Symmetry: D2
Subunit: 301 residues, 4 copies
């Protein structure tokens, strides 16, 4: 037997950080959950009970809090890059650091139409995430994402012209409800190290804002032919707006709202143009995925 793959460390590390402007009294909070898993010359911990190669997960936890004390926690792409770089530089025998960060929403409260200096509301369970893989000799691979963005449109969704055979019962529709939970990931060009990540810092918040804006506007305005066709338009617009992105991935459930035939009861009309009351279906659901990149096809376009 031999170790083909190994990583270890600490998961579910909750972190809060406050910034206090002593001049204005304005406070700003940041809250996240962090996972750090290390790789390197660690196989003997598995094979030989050699704990000398283990940077204790407790120590990794201490290091997350120390890094957050001594560095910005925003944008999360930067914080993740700083943290991962620390582990591969500090420890000769550690050759990769895998940093996952989930960012929790704390939106400043408006009280009597004025922003409150130190009060916040969890305005959505929507998250902003990063996956930062720091690989010694191979730079920094960053995937940025928004997840748990739950949306619904009551019309301007269609689904007709799909394959029909002996397995098919679904009726074509020219007007249905569309509801999803948006998981959208943008994959950055490889960065050579922390200096190159730092040189692009304003692009992280800007690209997250673009991804969210494009997701909401496209969902709201596309007279959707399918989830497939709608998500492709979101991905192509985000790629057009940030050249340092290589790919945009969407993973979208089709959260069904079924019509309810009430015609058995006093001839009530609640289908088609008369549909007012629907049954939201918890399961099953459609699931639609794609990864969009830029073309290099020159023939048979």
């Amino acid at each position: 037997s031999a170790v083909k793959a190994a990583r270890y460390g600490k998961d579910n590390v909750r972190v809060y950080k406050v910034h206090k402007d002593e001049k204005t009294g304005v406070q700003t909070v940041y809250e996240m959950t962090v996972c750090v898993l290390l790789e390197g010359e660690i196989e003997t911990s598995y094979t030989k009970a050699d704990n000398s190669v283990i940077v204790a997960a407790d120590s990794i936890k201490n290091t997350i809090y120390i890094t957050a004390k001594q560095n910005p926690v925003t944008p999360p792409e930067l914080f993740g890059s700083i943290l991962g770089t620390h582990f591969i530089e500090k420890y000769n025998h550690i050759h990769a650091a895998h940093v996952n960060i989930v960012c929790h929403r704390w939106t400043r409260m408006d009280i009597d139409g004025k922003p409150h200096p130190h009060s916040f509301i969890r305005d959505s369970e929507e998250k902003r995430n990063v996956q930062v893989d720091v690989v010694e000799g191979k730079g920094i691979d960053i995937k940025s994402s928004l997840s748990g963005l739950t949306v619904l449109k009551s019309t301007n969704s269609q689904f007709w012209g799909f394959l029909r055979d002996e397995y098919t019962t679904l009726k074509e529709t020219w007007d249905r409800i569309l509801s999803t939970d948006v998981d959208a990931t943008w994959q950055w060009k490889n960065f050579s190290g922390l200096q190159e990540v730092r040189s692009h810092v304003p692009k992280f918040d800007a690209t997250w804002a673009t991804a969210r804006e494009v997701t909401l506007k496209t969902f709201a305005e596309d007279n959707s032919a399918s989830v497939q066709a709608t998500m492709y338009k979101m991905a192509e617009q985000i790629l057009a707006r940030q050249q340092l992105i290589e790919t945009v991935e969407y993973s979208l459930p089709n959260k069904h709202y079924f019509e309810i035939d009430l015609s058995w009861h006093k001839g009530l009309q609640n289908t088609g143009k008369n549909a007012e009351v629907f049954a939201p279906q918890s399961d099953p659901n459609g699931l639609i995925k794609c990864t969009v990149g830029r073309s290099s096809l020159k023939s048979k376009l």
Copy 2:
């Protein structure tokens, strides 16, 4: 053996309703989860296998969708009162209907600074709830609530002067983080029937809006002496603003954010006035409850 208490019916009934203004094209959606449990002369279903006294839960489910088709679903206090009244009036042997409704947020999307006619966002897992108990011969008892409103303030919370004995380790503080999930319930005066509920319909949305506004402003502006003292101020202001409320109940967890002593590492200062990085605690938590009503004490005030 004898039946001391019994109720039965249908839980977790997901309901969506759309309103379509054909003039403006503006669509408005409502989504809820409904539970209806009936009481009455039903003991023989338990004791004698007498199913003749059971209004099938499947039929109760059909009735929820039919009621939603033929009546407003908003405010939920009205929808609940209509539904509960239907069961005690339709069925001679049914003497109480217990209607619980959870209302899910679908907030209209703003696209390029304009409200979209048919696109919505789940802007919070915060709920608006009702419990409506329709009791034949005893009218309609309504409890209204907001739940899952998650808030945090980074300063202007204190906790000192508490009892200290041989069980006490907690340090007094003059500056801590306060974070909670707000569960706030307002209990209406008994209504004689559906006509009296209908006569007060505008008060339901107005009182929910008042409860939320008072909760947010008080949380944000109170230099809090304790969760106890802060919630009491919220409850007294809501009672002052709606005479048809008898009681206001709060149930608030104290969701702890602990300081992290980093002085063992390079003398880093992260406690007291230098506290920037905190550890959010998932459990345990403080839990603080109270029900506030109006006084009738004339002596020893």
Copy 3:
């Protein structure tokens, strides 16, 4: 405004305790989650920012661990009674202690057909719970429960003879799947204090075992006319087997398994006597409740 009701304390306190037989090497573990809420002369903490009347929830947490160190944690009815009594005796101004305990399963592992001395498995998310209300001057009110016991029978469940009117679509059945999550509560006679609870200690484990045995055997052997009729038989047998119980309460969801008509596909027969493949429904569900006590009817039985 005046305080009509108030309680406060600590929730979600996770507790583990190990017993080590040094003679045999056999270790036994206990794991629970504890909530303690106090009542008494505490209104000034709410009305006057008077923290002198608050036994800090942090101190209540310390007290749970100290009690567990100095006393048995089993049966949970005893541990809860000890803990609640401590608060009303130690603090003159505290007049009630509300102790909720959830007990988590750690079942000894059998390895090569022999019980392992120190290895355990979470063999079910089924819980054993207590609610212990210690009220100064009014003794100790205990409710014991089992919850999250998930069961299914594939036949010997029926549902016919229910009310049929213009709201009814459900077909009568003489053979259906029955599946539920069992919540069963037994309410003890009021105990005068801790001495009387201690005098009955063996009855707590014995009555929990009886409730579980009766629940499983009745579910498995009753050719069920309805959930109502089946749960009534469980409750009456548990009352017959423990005179110190006053009431037995069941709360049972009817977790539906729907037939799937496949006759549209190659005439496949999958309904009635040919039903093999079913669709489990996550929601909605039936919900059936009753509280059974002993009779004192002497006429019109």
Copy 4:
């Protein structure tokens, strides 16, 4: 823009199947949740609103129930292989089918020491899973797993000799609690098609049973030097017992149980050899992973 990756279909499809021995009256139930995602010449559904290439997820759902009606659902490796093969054979333009199955426990009830013919208990939320990737021209890749197996040992776990530097606070221990949720995956040799999967059918149940037995016995008997060292022993034994497995992967959280120093209270001794009461930590947790395969190193072993 161009489609670099795409799949779509149906998730969260709950399936139940009953087998009825008419001779013995013995019934056997199977319950699972199924996901099927297809790949192939489907990019035009994304780029051109061409729904002609979509096998509707509703049709995929119908096909799961039809397959379950016409074929064994056990072992899940076989059911998954049948289902995936159907999609790549039926549809010329579909070139891969990705089938994920979660199997839910329904263990036969023993009533009065005899197995009941038609009553079952969810004896654990532990799952048995498969991932079956059917790739046209490349056969059938199967990963089998057990997940959610929650275990604890109260002693015979150690953690000492780990790296100590300026980030390290953790104390070495020679006796701690070890608790985890076991996620164990075994990767099968590539199968050429459905005939080769069928030729190995008895190996699926046997290898799952081996993986579980080895996991439980090793956890219980290993005087653990670390999670790393313990999981490596499990993986090497499972590889030794099934030559058709290429790799065994473990993913194990270290679910911490912290000692509680009570010496501040009446000198109570609850640490080290006197530790009886512990605080289970919900988060953070250690996370330890490895993939073990067979060696081909001939030098520098």
